[PDB]
Structure 1
Amino acid sequence: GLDKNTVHDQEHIMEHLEGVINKPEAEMSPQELQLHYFKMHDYDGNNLLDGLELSTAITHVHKQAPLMSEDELINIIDGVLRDDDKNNDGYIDYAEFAKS
């Protein structure tokens, strides 16, 4: 549920940056790869992470385990939004993401 080690994981960030950017980095600062983690899942381009993008951030298809059920996914996304989003906009900005 948006765990610190999940965003701070290097291999996940490396797999997502594979192909799109052609410079593989052996090491990166946790803040740098958390900026990369925020940027990779913003598919629309509005620099805001809404519930639908976090749905593809939490559940995943990586090439296994059965896909997470609807109720658990709803609970995780609702918890993340209620904890990190304080402006009641329904989105999460980078300030909100970096705060928690």
Structure 2
Amino acid sequence: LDKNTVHDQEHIMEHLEGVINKPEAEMSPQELQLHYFKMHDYDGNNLLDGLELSTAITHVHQAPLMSEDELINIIDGVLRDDDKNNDGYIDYAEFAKS
């Protein structure tokens, strides 16, 4: 996860409508990193796994779907470095910090 990949506030604006529809064009990148955490925690555990994050990066917004092993390489690398409690999960302690 590159930062600017998370820092597409107009895309998460395409995520958040109906749920909330007030325009706020001062959304700081950390204010929307937690948006990206929120809108992709479908399980409700507030604990992102590689499965939810796979849907985060694959999306349904055409574009060619990336290969499985390359998709492994990014998801294994992000799992390797981003979290530190060895949970199999990315957390607020882990996501916004890394």
Asked if TM exceeds 0.5, the reply is yes
Cα displacement (A) at 1:23: 1.8
Give 1:1-100 correspondences, 5 Å limit: 2-62=1-61, 64-100=62-98
Cα displacement (A) at 1:69: 1.2
Normalised to the residue count of structure 2, the TM-score between the two structures is: 0.93
Q: Percent identity at matched positions?
A: 100
Q: How far apart, in 1, do the equivalents of 2:10 and 2:39 lie? A: 14
Normalised to the residue count of structure 1, the TM-score between the two structures is: 0.91
Segments of 5+ residues of structure 2 without an aligned counterpart are none
Q: Note if contact 1:18-1:24 (Cα within 8 Å) is conserved in structure 2.
A: no
Q: How far apart, in 2, do the equivalents of 1:65 and 1:8 lie? A: 20
Bigger mean CA deviation after superposition, 15-24 or 69-78: 15-24
Which 4+ runs in 1 deviate beyond 4 A? Answer: none
Q: Note if contact 1:47-1:93 (Cα within 8 Å) is conserved in structure 2.
A: yes
Segments of 5+ residues of structure 1 without an aligned counterpart are none
Q: How far apart, in 2, do the equivalents of 1:20 and 1:67 lie? A: 28
SS in 2 for 1:94: coil
Bigger mean CA deviation after superposition, 7-16 or 49-58: 7-16
